[PDB]
Amino acid sequence: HMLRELCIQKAPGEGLGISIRGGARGHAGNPRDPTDEGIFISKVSPTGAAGRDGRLRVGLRLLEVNQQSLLGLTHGEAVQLLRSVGDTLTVLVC
């Protein structure tokens, strides 16, 4: 699980084209051990930017988007980061 930063081309108004899961847990979780709150890629759309680039896969841990930590962000805020404008988007994964 080597930490790596990927810069992925996309159309300037397009999102990265991945689905994510994880993040802060609720009342089934364990606040004494918050290390199971990572964000992971759960889908890669074949025609989206991540799919076209070919590198990202389901199961990767996603630590940052555009240099910003996902830790503690809500799902919706992480999705919004993945929809940031620009002709590239950067992810930090392992």
Numbering used by the authors: -1 to 0, 1098 to 1189
Manuscript excerpt for this entry:
Improved proteomic analyses subsequently revealed that, in addition to syntrophins, α1D-ARs also interact with the multi-PDZ domain containing protein scribble (SCRIB); and that α1D-ARs are expressed as modular homodimers, with one α1D-AR protomer bound to SCRIB, the other to syntrophin, in all human cell lines examined to date. A defining structural characteristic of SCRIB includes the presence of four clustered PDZ domains in the C-terminal portion of the polypeptide. Herein, we employed a combination of biophysical, biochemical and cell-based approaches to acquire structural insights into the α1D-AR:PDZ protein complex. Together, our data implicate SCRIB PDZ domains 1 and 4 as the primary anchor sites for the α1D-AR. Without significant expression of necessary PDZ proteins, α1D-ARs are retained intracellularly and produce weak functional responses, suggesting this protein:protein interaction site has the potential for pharmacological modulation.
Our model identified D571α1D-AR:R1110PDZ4 of the carboxylate binding loop and T570α1D-AR:H1170PDZ4 of α-helix B as possible α1D-CT PDZ ligand interaction sites within SCRIB PDZ4. SCRIB PDZ domain sequence alignment revealed that R1110, but not H1170, is unique to PDZ4, suggesting that this residue may be responsible for the specificity of α1D-AR to PDZ4. In support of our structural prediction, purified PDZ4 harboring either R1110G or H1170A mutations ablates α1D-CT binding. However, the structural role of R1110 is unknown. A superposition of the R1110G mutant with WT PDZ4 reveals a 4.5 Å shift of the carboxylate binding loop. We predict this shift creates steric hindrance that prevents the interaction between I572α1D-AR and PDZ4. Previous studies have found PDZ ligand:PDZ domain interactions are dictated by interactions of the C-terminal residue of the PDZ ligand. Finally, we demonstrate that SCRIB R1110PDZ4 serves as a unique α1D-CT interface site that could be targeted to modulate α1D-AR pharmacodynamics. Thus, targeting SCRIB PDZ4 may provide the highest opportunity to disrupt α1D-AR function without perturbing other SCRIB complexes.
